[PDB]
């Protein structure tokens, strides 16, 4: 079964730095592309980020682009997200998703998310 | 992989152009994966099948096979009902031996997306010139 | 078109190699045109070949075919010269009918460059999985 | 000469038409050049070829040989696209020994000119009736 | 059932590792049923086939097949592939009759899983002790 | 490269003439590729042709072969064709293996074009004297 | 002439590389006259030859023929001798009648030495790129 | 390669005569029609002359018509243009231009060109 166990999280002030993680066991993790998902408190699903099947097309939102990155590693299986400058919005659940097979993709699996402040 | 839905997307001359193929099964007579268009009538569909065969005892080595075909319609003079004219093939085989590591795999496959974008491909293909 | 030189660019599972290929003059005896590595000794060296076909009194329809090899070299001991040890092959061959426009046969091109790159022959090519 | 575009004018029974050429390659295996006209559909192009032979070991003779062919199309009933329903050729073949010099060879050229433009000509061709 | 990709897990001698296996399609003759574990070289692959014999009216003994076979990888000085030392096979064969039930099968499963476990057989097979 | 018009300039005894070769097409059964100068009366032209072995996989020696030869015209007497009293030829052929690089092959030819300009053989050519 | 030392200049593929042969005595048998690299171990020398047919009253054709071959060298484990790994050879033979001119010699010596440093043959020879 | 190297040129009163010429090599010079264009050093080009294949048809601009002769030789290569009446107006550059396969040109080919006063 398609699973995604993430790890990460905690209370860290702004302007700080983290580092997520994505397990991503069950599949052919190097041929799918992957995504970060967050969801606000208020209870609102937003966009983080995108990248492709071996890491070289990447696609950022506007309140992402200049202060994070998103990686993976094909040989571990992992999904990183690495952050920065931690502009006090940003308090979200950063759920895991696997991408459809397709152009722009429409989040066909999920995880569970790592409460971030 | 898993068979789902794989759509296409910046397909065309121009480049605005969608495609999605809705998964069909795969044949367990001859282990040949099947995606298909969404059209109701089974001669109007543009099918894409792909395969991967084991060396056997005659081959040796491993075989993938990727099909696409795409008919045309269009109704004559007394007719009702479209019917199918034309027939656009394509027919791609992959053979690789048993040591092949998966970066020489990986380099073929993308060795040949990045070789249909070249003009010199889409100039034997698109207008039927050879390259003189 | 015109042989020219080819760069291949985004080329790898990665996507950062390039593949730089010069042109190798086309053949009298068929009209292949061939393409050969930028700096390489001959039979050591990554081919591209195309050709295109008009109909005749056998076939009744136009045939463009694209057909890539690359080797490995091995440099054993006690040798100067490398050996090559496996090939890897694929070979596109299209087909249309002499009634087709411009924008079906480009309709084809663009979807087999855009297949390529689908999770659904990632895995079947450069990891053998078949499509369950 | 070298390929470029002929662009043809005062043609036409009245002699108001024009036409162009756009080039489309020399083919190795015979050494025939290729002109054509701008279509999309390869079959309803008005296409034409030239090719002079060198004297080989059997023919002794150079030999000039250009060709036209020109189809007229139109669609049917129940049918959508158009067809190709007749093909109106030309054969011209010229024929020239070693010691021939070249006004010879231009004479032959400008008489054929100054012949198809002769109101004995142009009443057996337009209206077919024989000289008498 | 169909096809998936098994993960066995808490596997070893330890018990503390893994082994994912993806499917490899039916071999349409036999109708054994392989699965094997994404490791690049595929010579050398943890390879898990299954047989069963097809449910038909007139069948007396239903008849399960499982193999493993397990191969090392040895990098011999003077070649640049690594070669197949030896293997580590493992042959299970079920036998039942048409009119056995479904607890006289599922004892037979689970005691053949429980007798592998217990220190009589992680003697005879790890250590090689033979039982006196 | 494709063939091309070729003025070959500063050739000569003095050094202060030219040669102007049009193209005359590749023959298509062994692959040689004529060059020819503009002089009327075709039985007596400069000729040049080139021929080069094709980019097989599994070729083990290339060779180039390069030929020239330079008719004399004669209008004798009682004739109104000049004759040809003799030729003048040249023949030129390289031979290379398939591990052999490109500056191994490009000093040969400069090598070979740097003789012909030395006064060992400007002399034994030129005014027939054998090295002693 | 007599012969001297040759310092062939600017010559390669960059054109700025040396080759200095010195004379190594005339064949007493057939007449051909040795040239050769000041290179230690000579098994592998740069090595050039020159053969003139002597003028006889009643010699009806007079044919000069120049030779180049160039080793390589290979260092293999295993032995204190540098190896020939191949060769790379050159063979250009003239062809004159007892009526030749002195101009006629001088103007085919100027050809091949100005058709050599043409891009047509510093692409069919170093790239071997057949003329098409 | 085409290559058109012209010549002539001077400082000449009005009223005079001139004759250019125009080089023509690495083509086959006798079987494409030639042409004379003029640049104004009020930069806009304008058009002299064309003559044919062999010589045959000429066709002439308004202001040349009178007073100019095109000629060419297809043994030695040349394309002439002989010049008379100078009225004061005819200060260009006169560009060699190779006419292209047709019935009316479009001057796929230049040259350089030689100044006049």
């Known amino acids: 079964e398609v699973q995604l166990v993430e790890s990460g999280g905690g209370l860290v002030k702004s302007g700080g730095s983290l580092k997520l993680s994505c397990a991503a066991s069950?599949?052919?993790?190097?041929?799918?592309?992957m995504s970060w998902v967050r969801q606000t408190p208020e209870k609102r699903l937003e966009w983080v980020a995108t990248?492709?099947?071996?890491?070289?097309?990447?696609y950022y939102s506007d309140n992402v682009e200049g202060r994070f990155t998103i990686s993976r590693d094909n040989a571990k299986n992992n999904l990183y997200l690495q952050m920065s400058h931690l502009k006090s919005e940003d308090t979200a659940i950063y759920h895991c998703?696997?991408?459809?097979?397709?152009?722009?993709?429409?989040?066909?699996?999920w995880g569970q998310g790592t409460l971030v402040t | 992989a898993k068979l789902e839905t794989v759509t296409l997307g910046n397909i065309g001359k121009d480049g605005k152009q969608t495609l999605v193929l809705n998964p069909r099964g795969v044949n367990p007579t001859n282990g040949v994966a099947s995606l298909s268009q969404a059209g109701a009538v089974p001669a109007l569909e543009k099918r894409v099948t792909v395969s991967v065969s084991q060396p056997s005892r005659n081959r040796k080595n491993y075989k993938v096979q990727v099909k696409i075909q795409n008919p045309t319609a269009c109704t004559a003079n007394g007719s009702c009902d479209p019917s199918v004219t034309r027939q656009a093939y394509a027919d791609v085989t992959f053979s690789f031996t048993q040591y092949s590591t998966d970066e020489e795999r990986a380099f073929v496959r993308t060795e040949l997306a990045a070789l249909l974008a070249s003009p010199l491909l889409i100039d034997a293909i698109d207008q039927l010139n050879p390259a003189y | 078109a015109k042989l020219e030189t080819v760069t291949l660019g985004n080329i790898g599972k990665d996507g950062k190699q390039t593949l730089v290929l010069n042109p190798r003059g086309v053949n009298p005896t068929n009209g292949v045109a061939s393409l050969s590595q930028a700096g390489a000794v001959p039979a050591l060296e990554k081919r591209v070949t195309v050709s295109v076909s008009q109909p005749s009194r056998n076939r009744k329809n136009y045939k463009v075919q694209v057909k890539i090899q690359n080797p490995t070299a091995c440099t054993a001991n006690g040798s100067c010269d490398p050996s090559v040890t496996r090939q890897a092959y694929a070979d596109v061959t299209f087909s249309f009918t002499q009634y087709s426009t411009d924008e079906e046969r480009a309709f084809v091109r663009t979807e087999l460059a855009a297949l390529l790159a689908s999770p659904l022959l990632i895995d079947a090519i450069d990891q053998l999985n078949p499509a369950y | 000469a070298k390929l470029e575009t002929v662009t043809l004018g005062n043609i036409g029974k009245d002699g108001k038409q024009t036409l162009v050429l756009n080039p489309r390659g020399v083919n190795p295996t015979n050494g025939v050049a290729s002109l054509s006209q701008a279509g999309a559909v390869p079959a309803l192009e008005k296409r034409v070829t030239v090719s002079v032979s060198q004297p080989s070991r059997n023919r002794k003779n150079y030999k000039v040989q250009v060709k036209i062919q020109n189809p007229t199309a139109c669609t049917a009933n129940g049918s959508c696209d158009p067809s190709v329903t007749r093909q109106a050729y030309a054969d011209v073949t010229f024929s020239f020994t070693q010691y021939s010099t070249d006004e010879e060879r231009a004479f032959v050229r400008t008489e054929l000119a100054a012949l198809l433009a002769s109101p004995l000509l142009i009443d057996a061709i337009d209206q077919l009736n024989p000289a008498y | 059932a169909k096809l998936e990709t098994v993960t066995l897990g808490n596997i070893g001698k330890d018990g503390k590792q893994t082994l994912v296996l993806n499917p490899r399609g039916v071999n349409p003759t036999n109708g054994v049923a392989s699965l094997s574990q994404a490791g690049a070289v595929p010579a050398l692959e943890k390879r898990v086939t299954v047989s069963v014999s097809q449910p038909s009216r007139n069948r007396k003994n239903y008849k399960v097949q499982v193999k493993i076979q397990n191969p090392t990888a040895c990098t011999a000085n003077g070649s640049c592939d690594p070669s197949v030392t030896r293997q580590a096979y493992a042959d299970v064969t079920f036998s039942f009759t048409q009119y056995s039930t479904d607890e006289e099968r599922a004892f037979v499963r689970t005691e053949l899983a429980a007798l592998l476990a217990s220190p009589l057989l992680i003697d005879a097979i790890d250590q090689l002790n033979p039982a006196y | 490269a494709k063939l091309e018009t070729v003025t070959l300039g500063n050739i000569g005894k003095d050094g202060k003439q030219t040669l102007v070769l049009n193209p005359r097409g590749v023959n298509p059964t062994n692959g040689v590729a004529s060059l020819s100068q503009a002089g009327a009366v075709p039985a007596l032209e400069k000729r040049v042709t080139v021929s080069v072995s094709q980019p097989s996989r599994n070729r083990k020696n290339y060779k180039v072969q390069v030929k020239i030869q330079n008719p004399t015209a004669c209008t004798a007497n009682g004739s109104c064709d000049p004759s040809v009293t003799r030729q003048a030829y040249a023949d030129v052929t390289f031979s290379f293996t398939q591990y052999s690089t490109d500056e191994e092959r490009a000093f040969v030819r400069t090598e070979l074009a740097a003789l012909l300009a030395s006064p060992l053989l400007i002399d034994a050519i030129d005014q027939l004297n054998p090295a002693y | 002439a007599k012969l001297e030392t040759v310092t062939l200049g600017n010559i390669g593929k960059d054109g700025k590389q040396t080759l200095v042969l010195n004379p190594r005595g005339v064949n007493p048998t057939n007449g051909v006259a040795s040239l050769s690299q000041a290179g230690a171990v000579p098994a592998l020398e740069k090595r050039v030859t020159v053969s003139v047919s002597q003028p006889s009253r009643n010699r009806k054709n007079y044919k000069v023929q120049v030779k180049i071959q160039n080793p390589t060298a290979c260092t293999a484990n295993g032995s204190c001798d540098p190896s020939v790994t191949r060769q790379a050879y050159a063979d250009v033979t003239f062809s004159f009648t007892q009526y030749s001119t002195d101009e006629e010699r001088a103007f085919v010596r100027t050809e091949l030495a100005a058709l050599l440093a043409s891009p047509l043959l510093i692409d069919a020879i170093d790239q071997l790129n057949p003329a098409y | 390669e085409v290559q058109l190297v012209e010549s002539g040129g001077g400082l000449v009163k009005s009223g005079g005569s001139l004759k250019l010429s125009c080089?023509?090599?690495?083509?086959?010079?006798?079987?494409?029609?030639?042409?004379?264009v003029r640049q104004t050093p009020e930069k806009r080009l304008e058009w002299?002359?064309?003559?044919?294949?062999?010589?045959?048809?000429?066709?002439?601009?308004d202001n040349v018509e009178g007073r100019f002769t095109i000629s060419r030789d297809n043994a030695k290569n040349n394309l002439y243009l002989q010049m008379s009446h100078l009225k004061s107006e005819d200060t260009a550059i006169?560009?060699?231009?190779?006419?292209?396969?047709?019935?009316?040109?479009?001057?796929?080919?230049?040259?350089?060109g030689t100044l006049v006063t």
């Open positions: 990248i492709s099947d071996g890491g070289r097309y990447i």
């Open positions: 998703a696997r991408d459809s097979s397709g152009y722009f993709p429409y989040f066909s699996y």
């Open positions: 069950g599949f052919t993790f190097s041929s799918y592309a």
